[PDB]
Design a binder for this molecule. Sequence first.
Ligand SMILES: CCCOc1ccc(C[C@H](CC)C(=O)O)cc1CNC(=O)c1ccc([C@]23C[C@H]4C[C@H](C[C@H](C4)C2)C3)cc1
Length: 258
Amino acid sequence: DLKSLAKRIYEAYLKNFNMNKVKARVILSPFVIHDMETLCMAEKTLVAKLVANGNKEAEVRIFHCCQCTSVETVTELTEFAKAIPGFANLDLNDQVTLLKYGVYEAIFAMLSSVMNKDGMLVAYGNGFITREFLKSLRKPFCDIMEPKFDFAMKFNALELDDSDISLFVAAIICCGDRPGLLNVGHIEKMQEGIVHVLRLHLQSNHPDDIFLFPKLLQKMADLRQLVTEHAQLVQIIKKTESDAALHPLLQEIYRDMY
Ligand SMILES: CCCOc1ccc(C[C@H](CC)C(=O)O)cc1CNC(=O)c1ccc([C@]23C[C@H]4C[C@H](C[C@H](C4)C2)C3)cc1
């Protein structure tokens, strides 16, 4: 039954997220954004509306686009969470709390799938923006980027596939030590359930790496630290960048988190 469970999670994953490792890799076998010219060209083609005006600084335009993808991923993650044994049985408040603290950890984890040493797949697989171009953005915007690449390079070295990743994201969501949780016991039990299936799955799908499970547990901790830091930088931008407004949904997510 745990094998079937793992499968269920994997199918929900393939079904709820527009992007996955296999699709990303086939594509990376896209318009390349490597400088300001290609950036502006990409915007006119892929998000025309955003530039059909008289327009904010390039850095802010990108920032807004990043927010847009996050809001979308929140929706995908919310639907995905229903395939986790016990999630849909939780109090609505706890479901909200679990998604609130888990979304960004999930987001940066899955982001690794479309990232390689030189850049990342963007805009529903229609673009590829270079890591170096992102580093060339003026501070503090160029500082949003790099930390995610650093994490992705190490995460991708674990050579996980979507069946692995789906369970990992599920595990990220089922976190009992999240602030405000009403029924921690039931949540801990749900968590124990997913980690158990994740442990067994890694064991059979990765017989060559006997430390994969421990490594991933560590990655979950890394992601949590990665997120608090990302939140800090977002906060800095919000306060110091007058033209860089934050989408209401994301403000609520960042509200009282870190
Ligand atoms: C290492 C960099 C990783 O990128 C990041 C970084 C942080 C975040 C989190 C965001 C930051 C505001 C958040 O807090 O929600 C999201 C992404 C995800 N960004 C995207 O998915 C993304 C989406 C669209 C684009 C565009 C931007 C321009 C150029 C090109 C076409 C079009 C217009 C979309 C790529 C770029 C990045």
